[PDB]
Curated annotation (Swiss-Prot), chain C:
Full-protein positions shown: 51 to 99 of 939
Organism: Saccharomyces cerevisiae (strain ATCC 204508 / S288c) (Baker's yeast)
Biological function: Involved in nucleolar processing of pre-18S ribosomal RNA and ribosome assembly.
Taxonomic lineage of the native organism: Eukaryota, Fungi, Dikarya, Ascomycota, Saccharomycotina
Name of the protein in question: U3 small nucleolar RNA-associated protein 21
Compartments reported by the entry: Nucleus, Nucleolus
Other notes: Present with 2020 molecules/cell in log phase SD medium.
Domain notes from UniProt: The WD repeats are grouped into two tandem seven-bladed beta-propeller regions.
Record note on quaternary structure: Interacts with snoRNA U3. Interacts with MPP10. Interacts (via WD repeats) with UTP18. Component of the ribosomal small subunit (SSU) processome composed of at least 40 protein subunits and snoRNA U3.
Superkingdom of origin: Eukaryota
WD repeat windows: 1-21, 31-49
UniProtKB/Swiss-Prot annotation, chain D:
Subunit field text: Interacts with snoRNA U3. Interacts with MPP10. Component of the ribosomal small subunit (SSU) processome composed of at least 40 protein subunits and snoRNA U3. In the absence of snoRNA3, forms a complex with other t-UTPs. This complex can associate with pre-18S ribosomal RNAs.
Protein localization: Nucleus, Nucleolus; Mitochondrion
Known function: Involved in nucleolar processing of pre-18S ribosomal RNA. Required for optimal pre-ribosomal RNA transcription by RNA polymerase I together with a subset of U3 proteins required for transcription (t-UTPs). Involved in ribosome biosynthesis.
Domain of life: Eukaryota
Organism whose genome encodes this protein: Saccharomyces cerevisiae (strain ATCC 204508 / S288c) (Baker's yeast)
Record's signal peptide: none
Additional comment: Present with 18200 molecules/cell in log phase SD medium.
Transmembrane regions: none
Protein name per UniProt: U3 small nucleolar RNA-associated protein 10
The family this protein is said to belong to: Belongs to the HEATR1/UTP10 family.
UniProtKB/Swiss-Prot annotation, chain F:
Annotated signal sequence range: none
Family: Belongs to the UTP5 family.
Organism: Saccharomyces cerevisiae (strain ATCC 204508 / S288c) (Baker's yeast)
Protein name: U3 small nucleolar RNA-associated protein 5
Domain of life: Eukaryota
WD repeats: 13-44, 45-82, 170-209, 211-245
Function: Involved in nucleolar processing of pre-18S ribosomal RNA. Required for optimal pre-ribosomal RNA transcription by RNA polymerase I together with a subset of U3 proteins required for transcription (t-UTPs).
Additional notes on this entry: Present with 33100 molecules/cell in log phase SD medium.
Localization annotation: Nucleus, Nucleolus
Subunit structure and binding partners: Interacts with snoRNA U3. Interacts with MPP10. Component of the ribosomal small subunit (SSU) processome composed of at least 40 protein subunits and snoRNA U3. In the absence of snoRNA3, forms a complex with other t-UTPs. This complex can associate with pre-18S ribosomal RNAs.
UniProtKB/Swiss-Prot annotation, chain H:
Compartments, as annotated in UniProt: Nucleus, Nucleolus
Further details from the record: Present with 6560 molecules/cell in log phase SD medium.
Job of this protein: Involved in nucleolar processing of pre-18S ribosomal RNA. Required for optimal pre-ribosomal RNA transcription by RNA polymerase I together with a subset of U3 proteins required for transcription (t-UTPs).
Quaternary assembly: Interacts with snoRNA U3. Interacts with MPP10. Component of the ribosomal small subunit (SSU) processome composed of at least 40 protein subunits and snoRNA U3. In the absence of snoRNA3, forms a complex with other t-UTPs. This complex can associate with pre-18S ribosomal RNAs.
Record-given protein name: NET1-associated nuclear protein 1
Part of the intact protein present: 848 to 896 of 896
Length: 64, 388, 49, 201, 334, 263, 121, 49
RNA sequence: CGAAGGAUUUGGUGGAU
């Protein structure tokens, strides 16, 4: 997230620093924030440990 | 125990099949392709070089092959035997491209044009019994450009189209060539006279032909030419080849090929004037492997196909314009089929086990849904699409 | 009990292991088979064995 | 997740569609809206027989009471018809389905449905509904003229509507609204009208 | 659909099994008025689909049979849900089965000297191994290929056991096929070698040496190609016959080789030295060969409705048999 | 393999009808033997195939895998009428005597048709007939009283009795030809078999076993047992001269080949 | 896009995108605004290529300030998608830098385009 | 006019639709809390469209 | 090399031991 957040910070910062007619709204920052949150959500949703699956033993059946 | 709301529950109980039958549907499935391999076309009489060009006869069940072997081998594709009808060795004339031609007015007129890295073109008249019964072949050499030799260095890249001379309403064939500096030279198919020439800025990379019907028995032939940068010119060949439209391929760079599909074209030729139809698709290849697809109905591409990672060497639509086959000669097995208008690549075919080799030629039969793919080893492999 | 042409074979359902076979081949192909405890009724042509 | 696996999707048909039937039956509007979401997604994922689609319409419209369910339902009906890609894709609705639809959706309602600019693609359903009107309702021939103006229909769909309207003139008495429908087709794409006349009469 | 069988579950669950002539078996839950599961193509439709399907009394096992010479058993495992077990029904699971050829066998051979097994090929494009003991065991050879639909029906077959478990020990010839496929008894699977005629002809004969190191293939064009079983590499090629080679045999000593063809000549070769010891012409075309290695006598079924016995040592006809009124399909030595 | 899927001369032997595949669609063409016609009937469906081809005295009866029989007029180049059996099983064989028309399905069901009336007269199945790939109707007078049918063995069936009359031990492989050379002598051949068995209809004993050099594809008989020409699978033609006169097994007397000048 | 200046013409854009393709094959190309920023700091950049259609354009306007200080030519091309494909990647690229290498096999072509960009400025 | 012309006309008439892939609705869980049913269905339709 | 993919691991049954 630090790598992603730093990249989006530069985009927002460069918009602020080099603007002739920037509106004092932060719209670029807000849209950049949503991208980092989306990156965080999918990244956090990841499960490093493999999920165990439903074991289905074909148990031996003998007639009665 | 012993409209209604419970309708949905009942219909599920009746049947255990829930996928609609594809036999009734006239539109092929988006993601699943029913394709079956047949016998190779070149098996009966193998070729001694790469299959540079492939062409099905517009009506008869014949397949024409060519290459640097300098032989025009014609096979009778039946799908089970594929015996060779005839062969014609052209001494010192490598074949970079060959094609059948049938006059749009005089259906009895059949003809084969072949060309290579030479300053001449060969025409082979197959009319009447020349194809099979005749002991000898009626061959003519086109070698005269009528003062325009400087523009043209080789006849190797050419295509054949139909031009309707509007003021007389007569319709005849034209042979289109690629020049040294954006030059497209247009010749009369039979007489060989130089009719007109079209010029574009930059190096000409590829061109294609589109037909626009006007009225009953009237149609206009448009020449579409593209530059390596991606700028596209559209010339009206019925008005001395004057530019009528200019546009650019969005995001285009290093363009390699251009093609149209969905109507009449070299792969889906017409048999009469009323069969002329306008093409609704346009695809632009590139060295990077991108294929921008445009809807002919600055333009914005409908899709940017990117499955292939090498230069596009063949772009071809199915006769009905529902499949786009894009292939590359750079690497082995570089061939994909794209479903239109979904623009989704078919997944089941080709597989790792599908034998394609260095794909260097592709052809769709006018009818029957057969696909022929030639490779650098000289083998033409034949597949059938069960939907057609 | 399964019919095999002119003879019938008895398998143990627990293991599908062959247990018994008909001693002799019937003169005609068997058409119907009925099994009741230790006795199996085989029908062929106009005779029931 | 099962989109690629067509066989697994087929095994999912009995279960989830059954659940949709139960959810539609529940008087709660939220349950009906949930059933609509499942049906629209499943239709896109896997094509189904028109009979399944038509049966789905009967269940959706049978218990359609809430206004919010009505809005979601109408969008659902149109999307299911879009998924249909066989012969009879734009054939007229059955008599029972046609009567059920108009009762739960007055013609003025669909005109409002067509009025909004952001309407989803609904040409196949409107083509089906338009042919349903002509077969069963003669007074409604005028509302057809408004419907065609509001929504553009595909070329073959227009041909099918023209094909039926030709039969209407031969059977049904000539009407100002009926000829006006023809004159509307005279104004737009005159040649295709002749082809329908040439093929039919 | 057409119903061919019906049966009810007596294990305490209200289940009805419906068999159809299409080869389907459907299970319904009478209490819930729903379909539990459908078993597809358990039995062939061409042979009547599901002729009979019976739930065993008081057990979750169902036995199915058909006209394809197959008997199968399926078990309904206990529901894996602690509650609402009736809703969560495990699909039926394949348990065990017995079977055989669906069409009359085309070729047969005894697998081993003990006479405990036999190899069988049928027009249904399958090779089967049948036990001759009470166990009645039957196993189909796996056709899964090695890497380095069913195959066409087998027209010829040869087998040896000198090198069983070391490498391939069976050679089979297929109809309208220009190569012969190898198999392995020990693995009970198709082999890893394919032997080609190398003369654009169909394989008409296959033979093996007693040592198990050489495989012989006779083509329809008259060429005899000799391969090595261990490596599947062509070693020698004899070209004497001009018509099809209908029989190849080699003696137990691997010295004298005999071949016969439709041209009617019987060729004698020296396998070690690769020389033509002699050539014998018969009145009629030769259809088959059987070689008796202990006595060095081989019999030939001639087109004139006779069996000609020839001794390889002196290359002369010793016995000629007459009496058959039509073509001799097959014959063997005691 | 040969491109020509099926072929049949007309009774006069002057016109040959052959069916071949163009791309995926079978086309039926007719040529004059004694001496080019560019016109072929085209089957519009890839699935449709011609299983049987029989001349009629200028029409040809074409059996199809669809389960229906087409009557084709060569001059008009259009299917004049189609005889449809109730079932959908492919027609295995067809034979004709005047107005009589008998076919057999893959379901082993016989059918009877009248060309003049265009009607399905009767359909029946005879037990002990587990397959039926060949049907031949005996030239007995002007009416059909019995039929020769063969799948692997050969059977004689009486139409009125609707039961078998006699059984001949046939070839191991499916029977490919069942032509009746003369009265009480009919020849039989099988797929991939070099042997032709001549059986006696009344007695049932194999009179002779003619042998060809290779597998037999087609069979033609001349006059009344005068001469028999069989086309071998290797591409040669063998002629048997007076095969109905050692004695058990006979070999062809004359062999005919075609070779180009080059070789 | 008034801020994008100088914007190369159609004839010059093709030449620039031609050199970019060759540099990509020879591993002489640094893709992205951030790497292009680094190359200016290390003084290993022949010149910088930027895409005029980038929205917001500001994310690459810092490069002209660095380029002018370091005396490195820079130029704008009309399309970032075209720049991306020329670079040899599946994603759009807004900026790129041609790394300096006096032993390169395409050295003459880089200097020819560099001179044309200098004239343009 | 001919039937194949009508068939090709029907083929041309048909238009593309956005297919549903594996990763199309995964983000729904992220914004599944405190969301009205109608809005959820509208978002589903928007993704489908 | 190559007709509607390839590698590794693993549960159960059937047959010998």
């Amino acid at each position: 997230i630090a790598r992603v957040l730093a990249a989006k910070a530069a985009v927002s910062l460069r918009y602020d620093a080099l603007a002739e007619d920037r509106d004092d709204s932060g719209d670029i920052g807000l849209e950049s924030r949503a991208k980092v949150e989306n990156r965080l959500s999918q990244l956090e949703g990841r499960d490093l440990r493999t999920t165990p699956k439903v074991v289905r033993e074909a148990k031996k059946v003998e007639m009665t | 125990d012993e409209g209604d709301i419970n309708a949905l529950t009942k219909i599920l109980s009746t049947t255990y099949n829930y996928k609609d039958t594809l036999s009734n549907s006239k539109l092929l499935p988006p993601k699943k392709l029913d394709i079956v391999r047949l016998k190779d076309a070149n098996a009966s009489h193998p070729s001694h070089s790469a299959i540079q060009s492939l062409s099905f006869h517009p009506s008869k069940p014949l397949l024409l092959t060519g290459g640097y072997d300098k032989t025009l081998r014609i096979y009778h594709i039946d799908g089970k035997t594929n015996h060779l009808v005839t062969s014609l060795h052209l001494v010192g004339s490598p074949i970079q491209t060959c094609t059948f031609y049938t006059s749009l007015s005089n259906q009895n007129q059949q003809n084969i044009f072949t060309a290579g890295r030479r300053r001449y073109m060969h025409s082979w008249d197959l009319s009447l019994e020349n194809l099979t019964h005749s002991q000898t072949a009626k061959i003519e050499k086109f070698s005269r450009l009528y003062g325009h030799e400087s523009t043209q260095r080789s006849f190797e890249n050419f295509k054949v189209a139909h031009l309707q001379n509007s003021q007389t309403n007569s319709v005849h064939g034209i042979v289109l060539l690629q020049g040294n500096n954006g030059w497209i030279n247009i010749l009369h198919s039979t007489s060989g006279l130089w009719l007109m020439g079209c010029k574009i800025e930059g190096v000409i990379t590829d061109f294609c032909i589109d037909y626009q019907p006007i009225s009953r028995g009237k149609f206009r032939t448009i020449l579409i030419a593209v530059n390596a940068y991606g700028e596209v010119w559209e010339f009206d060949l019925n008005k001395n080849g004057h530019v009528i439209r200019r546009w650019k391929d969005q995001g285009g760079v290093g363009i390699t090929k251009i093609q149209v599909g969905g109507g009449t074209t070299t792969t889906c030729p017409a048999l009469q004037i009323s069969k002329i139809k306008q093409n609704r698709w346009l695809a632009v290849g590139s060295e990077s492997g991108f294929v921008n697809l445009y809807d002919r109905n600055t333009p914005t591409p409908v899709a940017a196909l990117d499955q292939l990672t090498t230069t596009i060497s063949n772009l071809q639509f199915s006769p009905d314009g529902q499949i786009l086959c894009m292939a590359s000669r750079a690497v082995k097995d570089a061939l994909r089929l794209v479903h239109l208008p979904s623009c989704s690549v078919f997944s089941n075919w080709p597989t790792s086990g599908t034998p394609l080799g260095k794909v260097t030629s592709v052809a769709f039969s006018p009818s029957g849904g057969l696909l022929a793919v030639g490779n650098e080893q000289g083998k033409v492999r034949l597949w059938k699409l069960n939907h057609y | 009990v399964t019919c095999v042409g002119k003879t019938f074979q008895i398998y143990d359902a627990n293991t599908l292991h062959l247990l018994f076979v008909s001693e002799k081949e019937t003169p005609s192909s068997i058409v119907a088979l009925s099994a009741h405890f230790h006795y199996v009724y085989a029908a062929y042509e106009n005779k029931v064995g | 997740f099962n989109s690629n696996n067509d066989e697994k999707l087929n095994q999912l048909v009995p279960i989830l569609l059954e659940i949709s039937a139960k959810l539609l039956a529940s008087k709660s509007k939220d349950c009906q809206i949930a059933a609509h979401t499942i049906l629209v997604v499943f239709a896109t994922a896997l094509p189904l027989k028109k009979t399944i689609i038509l049966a789905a319409m009967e269940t959706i419209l049978s218990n359609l009471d809430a206004k919010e369910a009505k809005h979601s339902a109408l969008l659902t009906i149109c999307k299911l018809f879009q998924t249909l890609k066989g012969q009879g894709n734009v054939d007229q609705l059955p008599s029972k389905i046609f009567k059920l639809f108009d009762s739960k959706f007055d013609t003025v309602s669909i005109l409002t449905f067509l009025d909004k600019e952001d309407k989803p693609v609904c040409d196949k359903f409107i083509t089906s509904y338009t042919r349903s009107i002509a077969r069963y309702d003669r007074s409604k021939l005028n509302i057809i003229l408004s419907l065609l103006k509001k929504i553009r229909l595909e070329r073959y769909e227009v041909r099918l509507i023209i094909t039926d309207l030709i039969y209407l003139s031969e059977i049904l008495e000539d009407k100002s609204q009926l000829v006006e429908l023809f004159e509307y087709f005279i104004s737009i794409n005159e040649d295709l009208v002749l082809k329908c006349l040439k093929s039919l009469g | 659909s057409r119903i061919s069988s019906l049966s009810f579950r007596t294990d305490g669950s209200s289940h009805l099994s419906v068999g159809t002539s299409s080869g389907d078996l459907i299970f319904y839950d009478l209490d819930r008025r729903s379909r539990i599961h459908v078993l597809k193509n358990i039995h062939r439709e061409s042979y009547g689909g599901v002729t009979q399907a019976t739930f065993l009394n008081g057990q979750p096992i169902i036995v199915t049979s058909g006209g394809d010479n197959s008997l199968k058993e399926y078990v309904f495992d206990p529901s894996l849900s602690q509650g609402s077990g009736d809703v969560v029904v495990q699909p039926p699971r394949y348990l065990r089965s017995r079977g055989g050829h669906s069409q009359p066998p085309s070729y047969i051979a005894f697998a081993d000297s003990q006479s405990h097994f036999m190899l069988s090929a049928s027009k249904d494009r399958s090779l089967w191994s049948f036990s001759l003991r009470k166990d009645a065991q039957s196993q189909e050879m796996s056709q899964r290929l090695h890497k380095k639909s069913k195959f066409p029906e087998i027209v010829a077959l040869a087998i040896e056991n000198a090198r069983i478990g070391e490498w391939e020990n069976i050679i089979t010839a297929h109809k309208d096929e220009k190569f012969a496929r190898t198999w392995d008894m020990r693995n009970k699977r198709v082999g890893r070698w394919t032997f080609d005629t190398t003369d654009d002809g169909f394989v008409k004969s296959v033979a093996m040496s007693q040592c198990g190191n050489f495989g012989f293939i006779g083509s329809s064009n008259g060429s005899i190609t000799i391969y090595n079983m261990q490596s599947g590499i062509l070693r020698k090629k004899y070209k004497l016959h001009k018509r099809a080679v209908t029989g190849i045999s080699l003696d137990g000593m691997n010295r004298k080789m005999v071949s016969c063809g439709l041209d009617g000549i019987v060729g004698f070769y020296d396998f070690n030295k690769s020389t033509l010891l002699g050539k014998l012409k018969l009145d009629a075309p030769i259809t088959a060969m059987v070689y008796h290695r202990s006595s060095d006598l081989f019999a030939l079924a001639l087109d004139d409705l006779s069996i000609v016995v020839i001794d390889a040592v002196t290359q002369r006809v010793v016995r000629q048999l007459w009496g058959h009124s039509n073509r001799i399909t097959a014959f063997d030595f005691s | 393999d040969s491109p020509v899927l099926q072929s049949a001369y007309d009774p006069s032997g002057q016109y040959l009808c052959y069916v071949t595949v163009a791309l995926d669609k079978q086309r039926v063409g007719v040529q004059p033997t004694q001496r080019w016609n560019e016109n072929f009937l085209y089957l519009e469906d890839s699935k449709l195939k011609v299983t049987c081809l029989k001349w009629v005295n200028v029409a040809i009866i074409l059996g199809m895998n669809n389960g229906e029989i087409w009557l084709y007029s060569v001059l008009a180049n259009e299917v004049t009428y189609k005889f449809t059996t109730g079932n959908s099983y492919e027609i295995k064989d067809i034979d004709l005597m005047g107005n009589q028309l008998w076919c057999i399905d893959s379901s082993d069901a016989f059918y009877q048709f009248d060309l003049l009336q265009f009607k399905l007269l009767q359909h029946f199945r005879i037990n002990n007939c587990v397959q039926l790939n060949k049907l031949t109707i005996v030239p007995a007078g002007d009416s059909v009283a019995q039929l020769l049918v063969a799948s692997h063995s050969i059977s004689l069936i009486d139409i009125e009795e609707k039961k078998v009359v006699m059984t001949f031990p046939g070839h191991v492989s499916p029977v490919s030809t069942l032509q009746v050379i003369t009265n009480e002598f009919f020849i039989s051949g099988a797929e991939g078999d070099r042997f032709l068995n001549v059986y006696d209809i009344h007695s049932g004993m194999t009179k002779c076993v003619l042998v060809a050099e290779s597998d037999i594809k087609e069979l033609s008989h001349s006059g009344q047992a005068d001469s028999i020409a069989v086309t071998t699978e290797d591409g040669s033609l063998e002629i048997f001269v007076d095969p109905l006169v050692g004695n058990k097994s006979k070999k062809s007397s004359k062999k005919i080949q075609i070779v180009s000048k080059d070789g | 896009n008034p801020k994008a200046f100088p914007l190369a013409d159609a004839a010059l854009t093709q030449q620039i995108l031609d050199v970019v393709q060759q540099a990509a094959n020879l591993r002489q190309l640094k893709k992205g605004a951030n790497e292009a920023t680094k190359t200016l700091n290390r003084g290993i950049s022949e010149f910088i290529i930027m895409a005029a259609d980038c929205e917001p354009i500001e994310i690459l306007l810092h490069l002209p300030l660095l380029c002018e200080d370091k005396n490195v030519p820079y130029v704008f091309v009309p399309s970032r998608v075209a720049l991306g494909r020329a670079c040899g990647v599946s994603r759009p690229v807004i900026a790129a830098s041609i790394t300096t290498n006096d032993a390169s096999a395409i050295k003459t072509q880089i200097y020819a385009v560099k001179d044309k960009i200098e004239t343009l400025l | 006019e001919d039937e194949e012309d009508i068939a090709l006309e029907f083929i041309n008439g048909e238009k593309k639709d956005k297919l549903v892939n594996m990763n199309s609705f995964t983000s729904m869980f992220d914004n599944i809390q405190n969301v009205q049913m109608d809005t959820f269905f509208d978002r589903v339709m928007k993704v489908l469209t």
